[PDB]
Amino acid sequence: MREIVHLQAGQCGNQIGAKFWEVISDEHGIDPTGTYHGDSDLQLERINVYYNEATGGKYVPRAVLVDLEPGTMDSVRSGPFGQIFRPDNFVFGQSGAGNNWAKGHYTEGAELVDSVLDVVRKEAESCDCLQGFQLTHSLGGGTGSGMGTLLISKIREEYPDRIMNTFSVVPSPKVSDTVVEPYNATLSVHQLVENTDETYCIDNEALYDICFRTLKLTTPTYGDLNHLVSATMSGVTTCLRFPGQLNADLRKLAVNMVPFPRLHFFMPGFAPLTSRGSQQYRALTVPELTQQMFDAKNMMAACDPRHGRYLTVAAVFRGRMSMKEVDEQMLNVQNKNSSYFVEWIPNNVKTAVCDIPPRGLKMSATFIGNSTAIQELFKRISEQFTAMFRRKAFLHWYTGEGMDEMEFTEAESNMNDLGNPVVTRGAC
């Protein structure tokens, strides 16, 4: 039996990860207390992959939560399906990351990453494989990046051979939220690159588009936006739960999706996403699903693949579907469109089918693409940070927190020396 702990950190991970648990609970039958008031037995035959059983039918979620300001924590609790987490898992830290990648990889952080690794270790020993981990963080910010990096580092430093699929909300391209959004990220990407195995850059501006262009959601709370993020996270780790045909776990994806050891930043995307009125007009079938699976509109990122190439893309389908139809649409959508998909690596697509479909749908899928176009989002951050380290702006803060100038230059260099590669192996 495999095992994945869901490390959460900061207002971002808290609400997003909370939504993760609510979605995965329902798909597994678990109620807002822990009792399996569910139906099919096939839902519990594999729950040791997200829920540790507590003497008394209370399947408790293995979820370590790390916030540096008891506040997004109170939110996690109040939330309906937010009383299932085990007290200890909640690692508070009355202080404030104060949106400073420094005040998170240096000050406030250190005096908490010790307690964090404690919870993690305990939950990491209670396993029979420790397949990997899963961090929910906001690359741009503090409690998300500062802690995220420190924790992600400590995890890889110790547990050496285990996956680490991070679902991060990359800084947006249009409007920003933290003036220090560039700095916070450049220092972060640096770490994420040399440490993780599979990020899933979930840009916010995207989810917003999906909310008004595909779903027509009029008044979109930060709740609806999360459900989308949840669908993906779940789909990716479905085969390591329910059964099916061509199963593919997390190492499978990575090994079959990471060309060279660095191009690991990937692009998410759900599949049957319809509308509040068009649904009655759409007919679900591997065909239709694809024209949407590949409709850049879905790709919840920010780099319309059209303006780049596609190293490797995996699509974990879910539901009773004919593999002929599956392989067909996959190939057909890899011939008609060919100038995009690269050629230095044939059979670019990667199929996968985990039978048991979503609860309330006939078929589904999760498109995870590794585009060379991701350079777009990166380029912005670099250029932004560029005009920010030059006129030495909003740095007095980070500097004081024991972060020498080079510590920033070195970082910029990397994302730039990470931007280059994407073009190097993005030219062939």
Binding site: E157, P160, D404, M406, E407
Partner: peptide, 23 residues
């Protein structure tokens, strides 16, 4: 002056390489 950064980042890489040679 203010050597600081030299001993800091070099000490990081030394203790790093020492750790993955212990392992």
């Amino acid at each position: 002056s203010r050597l600081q950064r030299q001993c800091k980042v070099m000490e990081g890489e030394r203790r790093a390489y020492s750790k993955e040679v212990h392992q």
